[PDB]
Amino acid sequence: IGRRPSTTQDRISTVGIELFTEQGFDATSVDEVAEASGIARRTLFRYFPSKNAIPWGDFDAHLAEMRAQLAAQPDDIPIVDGLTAALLQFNAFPASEEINHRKRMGLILRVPALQAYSVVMYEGWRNVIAEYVASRLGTSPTDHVPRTVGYLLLGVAMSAYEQWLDDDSLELNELLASGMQSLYDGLSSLGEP
Amino acid sequence: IGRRPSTTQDRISTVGIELFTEQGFDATSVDEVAEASGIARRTLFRYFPSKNAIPWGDFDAHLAEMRAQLAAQPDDIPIVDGLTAALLQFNAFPASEEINHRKRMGLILRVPALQAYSVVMYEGWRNVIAEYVASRLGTSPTDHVPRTVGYLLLGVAMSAYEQWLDDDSLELNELLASGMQSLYDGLSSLGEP
């Protein structure tokens, strides 16, 4: 998003990402991120348990906004539209924030140790989706339908971002919307005359 | 699947999984798997680069069967039906093989280091799906639509397996089929009167 005034944690994340991008992820130590951030490694480890957390920033806070958004949407609105709005909003940045967000997702999607580590971050993201779908269906978040939906929504997000990193000339919001349209329509008509 | 006569590699995998299940994954060394398998650790490392590979077995061979299946399906058949057939077949075991396959997926889905490691295995699986969809649409496997489909098909697989591990009384094939039906129909009608 990049909307709100920067915190110490989200400012550490940002200088970290800029470091990792310029010098490479494995070439940058946690001590360089700390010093570049004007803090002690104690102050840094208060905000991140590891080096692999630094690119994710304050993901818990992001997840709490998405969850409150989904929970504040009127219940007279179709579930799929809820899902679309969240997908589009919470990957939506000002033109100002594109270079930094593209830096972030570049690290997260293409550094193998961050790909491995991010399974737990994605799981928390999916749980927010399952929780929303479960309440609206009057059901449980660990049931099959809510769980499946969480996984399918993550799939459109992941595809869009891979596609977007692969080509500068593409718009993330447009890619997310195409991906979401396919999830909305379903795959019955795929390749069909 | 569990269909064909057992190889040295797929027999190492099986004794490994049984060891890991009985003693725990982190408690079992690669040397115990080797000895339990009646081979030298050199012979084992020929077949697996790591301990984390052992549960996956000969996944390359599995992937080559799925790919040949998808490529041998007549082209007068809808793409979604191709996708369904592959999803259902390549997670289909004889009643005989259920206990061992459930052991396998228990390790892969619930040991955090295997969850992390399996992103690369899942990527190869998704690429087989994208390749099939790309040929049928006359397009490229790195294009948006084929990539998205690969991710959406993986989502139904992952959901089904999580659901199946969570409850003995459920059938994997039934869960995969429900999941696939939702991908076929699309999410427009979800929660809708």
Note down the domain range covering A31: 7-49
Q: Is B183 on the interface with A (CB under 8 A)?
A: yes
CA distance A60 to A193: 45
Taking the CA of residue A109 as centre, how many other CA atoms within 13 Å lie in the half-sphere pointing to its CB?
16
Q: Which residue has the tokens 């991008």?
A: A21
CA distance A126 to A105: 18
Residue from A115, A148, A149, A189 to probe the interface with B (highest B Cβ count within 10 Å): A148
Does the beta-carbon distance from A184 to B186 stay under 8 Å? yes
CB atoms within 10 A of CB A130: 23
Asked whether residue B132 is domain-assigned, the answer is yes
Which ranges of chain A does DSSP label H, i.e. alpha helix? 8-23, 30-36, 41-47, 59-72, 79-89, 98-110, 112-137, 144-166, 172-185
CA distance B163 to B35: 34
| Contact by Cβ (8 Å): B82, B74 | no
CA distance A37 to A60: 21
Taking CB atoms and an 8 Å cutoff, what residues of chain A touch B187?
79-80, 83, 149, 152, 183-184, 186
Asked if A32 and A66 sit in the same domain, the reply is no
Taking CB atoms and an 8 Å cutoff, what residues of chain B touch A179?
144, 148
The structure tokens listed for B96 are: 């005989």
Asked whether residue B193 is domain-assigned, the answer is no
Could you tell me the CATH number of the domain that includes residue B39?
A: 1.10.10.60
CA distance A131 to B123: 27
- Report the number of distinct structural domains present in chain A: 2
The structure tokens listed for A187 are: 């795959």
Work out the angle between the directed axes of helices A98-110 and A8-23 (0-180°, nearest 10): 70
Residues 6+ apart with CB under 8 A from B101: B2, B93
Asked whether residue A166 is domain-assigned, the answer is yes
- Phi and psi (nearest 5°) for B37? -95, 0
| CB neighbour class for B24 (10 Å; exposed up to 12, middle 13-18, buried from 19) | exposed
Q: Which residue has the tokens 């179709």?
A: A78
CA B125 to chain centre: 8
CB atoms within 10 A of CB B52: 18
Query: How many residues can be counted in chain B?
Result: 193
CA distance A8 to A61: 13
Asked if B57 and B11 sit in the same domain, the reply is no
CA distance A21 to A100: 10
Residues 6+ apart with CB under 8 A from B132: B67, B70, B71, B79, B82, B83, B86
Q: CA–CA distance from A134 to each of A69, A141, A143, B98, B169 (Å)? A: 15, 5, 8, 30, 22
Asked if A80 and A100 sit in the same domain, the reply is yes
| Contact by Cβ (8 Å): A56, A77 | no
Q: Taking Cα atoms as reference points, which of B31, B35, B37 lies closest to residue B14?
A: B37
CA distance B184 to B104: 28
Asked whether residue A192 is domain-assigned, the answer is no
DSSP A93-131: --GGGHHHHHHHHHHHHHSHHHHHHHHHHHHHHHHHHHH
Q: CA–CA distance from B131 to each of A28, B57, B99, B146 (Å)? A: 37, 23, 32, 7
Could you tell me the CATH number of the domain that includes residue A116?
A: 1.10.357.10
Asked if A36 and A114 sit in the same domain, the reply is no
CA distance A181 to B152: 13
Asked if A109 and A22 sit in the same domain, the reply is no
Asked if A68 and A80 sit in the same domain, the reply is yes
Taking the CA of residue A62 as centre, how many other CA atoms within 13 Å lie in the half-sphere pointing to its CB?
20
The structure tokens listed for A102 are: 């593209």
Asked if B82 and B35 sit in the same domain, the reply is no
Taking the CA of residue A111 as centre, how many other CA atoms within 13 Å lie in the half-sphere pointing to its CB?
22
Asked whether residue B57 is domain-assigned, the answer is yes
CA B66 to chain centre: 10
CA distance A184 to A153: 10
The structure tokens listed for A179 are: 């991906």
CA distance A106 to A100: 10
CA distance B84 to B181: 9
Is residue B90 helix, strand or coil?
Answer: coil
Q: CA–CA distance from A14 to each of A4, A8, B23, B151 (Å)? A: 14, 10, 43, 29
Query: How many residues can be counted in chain A?
Result: 193
Does the beta-carbon distance from B155 to A155 stay under 8 Å? yes
- Burial string for B84-113 (b: 16+ CB within 10 Å, else e) reads bebbeebbebeeeeeebbbbbbbbbbebee
Asked if A90 and A116 sit in the same domain, the reply is yes
Residues 6+ apart with CB under 8 A from A58: A7, A9, A10, A13
Asked if A129 and A68 sit in the same domain, the reply is yes
Asked if A54 and A77 sit in the same domain, the reply is yes
CA distance B40 to B38: 7
Residues 6+ apart with CB under 8 A from A150: A125, A126, A127, A128, A129, A130, A133, B159
Is residue A31 helix, strand or coil?
Answer: helix
| Contact by Cβ (8 Å): B154, B89 | no
Which ranges of B7-111 does DSSP label H, i.e. alpha helix? 8-23, 30-36, 41-47, 59-72, 79-89, 98-110
Taking CB atoms and an 8 Å cutoff, what residues of chain A touch B191?
78-79, 133, 136-137
What is the largest distance, in Å, between two alpha-carbon atoms of chain A?
62
CB atoms within 10 A of CB B71: 13
CA distance A100 to B36: 51
Asked whether residue A19 is domain-assigned, the answer is yes
Element (H, E) at B135: helix B112-137
The structure tokens listed for B51 are: 């301990």
Is residue B84 helix, strand or coil?
Answer: helix
Asked if B126 and B111 sit in the same domain, the reply is yes
Closest residue to A79, CB basis, from B119, B178, B190:
B190
Asked whether residue A140 is domain-assigned, the answer is yes
For A184, which DSSP code? H
Asked if B87 and B55 sit in the same domain, the reply is yes
The structure tokens listed for A174 are: 């447009």
Asked whether residue A193 is domain-assigned, the answer is no
Question: What is the phi-psi region of residue B138: left when phi exceeds 0, alpha when psi lies from -120 to 50, beta otherwise?
Answer: left
CA distance A116 to A67: 25
CB atoms within 10 A of CB A187: 24
- Phi and psi (nearest 5°) for A147? -60, -45
